[PDB]
A = this chain, B = another copy of it.
Amino acid sequence: AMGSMERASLIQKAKLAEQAERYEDMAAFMKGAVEKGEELSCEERNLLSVAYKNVVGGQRAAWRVLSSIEQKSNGPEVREYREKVETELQGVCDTVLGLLDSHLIKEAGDAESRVFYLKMKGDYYRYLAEVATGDDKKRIIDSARSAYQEAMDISKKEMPPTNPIRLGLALNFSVFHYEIANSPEEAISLAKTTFDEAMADLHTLSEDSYKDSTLIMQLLRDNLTLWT
């Protein structure tokens, strides 16, 4: 539906949708922009991520309320409605994963773009894994793991330890280990090593970079407090 709209107009409308808190519209504009086929700038990658994170975050919150009511009930209506919300969540994750596969990741050569997209791939497989069961669940968990691990390998070779995308990748992979992979010790070790290696590199930063990196460090420390 966005094929007739100019790329620059889709980006401008995504920014308006964000100001209006219209995140489904924001995500549809950014999907249209990706589908023009050109690579995304740093600001445009952030608009894509913010749009879909807010859409899927509303779905995940609704799914968790519905799944809790269903587990306490355990007619068909709670399970049917939890399944409807689940299918729509799955469809948003499939959409994001499809944009990353066709063709954002294959054209991303710089570390900042490639790490960003592989982190998104890990996040959206992680959201699929939260609602998956059984075996299917195993291959979805391993897809999230594999995307996070490739992002981590690149980030350690190519970015300093205080880089905010490297920090946010390590924060989300630590949450994957704690909440999805049943690996709390791996989650704690990754968050602690990431925090400590960033702390040692803060002396290299400007005032504004120091604020950006310490913000994410405090999220690592908040989880370490929750988990220990």
Which A residues lie at the B interface, using CB under 8 A? 9, 12-13, 16-17, 19-22, 25, 58, 61-62, 65-66, 69, 75, 77-78, 80-81, 84-85
Contact = CB atoms under 8 A, between A and B. Distances in A.
A65 B20 CA distance: 6
B75 A20 contact: no
A19 B70 CA distance: 13
Contacts of A58: 21
Contacts of A22: 62, 85
B12 A77 contact: yes
Contacts of A19: 65-66, 69
- In the complex, the count of this chain's copies comes to 2
Contact of A62 (B20, B81, B84): B20
Nearest to A24: B24
Nearest to A59: B22
A224 to B, nearest CB: 30
Given A13-B80, A20-B62, 13 more contacts: A9-B75, A12-B77, A13-B77, A13-B81, A17-B81, A19-B66, A20-B61, A20-B65, A20-B85, A21-B58, A22-B62, A22-B85, A25-B81
Nearest to A70: B16
A61 B21 contact: yes
Minimum-distance CB pairs A-B, first 5: A20-B62, A20-B65, A12-B77, A13-B81, A9-B77
A47 to B, nearest CB: 15
A69 B22 CA distance: 15
Contact of A16 (B9, B20, B21, B77): B77
A81 B21 contact: no
A91 B128 CA distance: 34
B75 A21 contact: no
A200 to B, nearest CB: 43
A31 to B, nearest CB: 16
Contacts of A66: 16, 19-20
Nearest to A66: B20
29 contacts: A9-B75, A9-B77, A12-B75, A12-B77, A13-B77, A13-B80, A13-B81, A16-B66, A16-B69, A16-B77, A16-B78, A16-B81, A17-B81, A19-B65, A19-B66, A19-B69, A20-B61, A20-B62, A20-B65, A20-B66, A20-B85, A21-B58, A21-B61, A21-B62, A21-B65, A22-B62, A22-B85, A25-B81, A25-B84
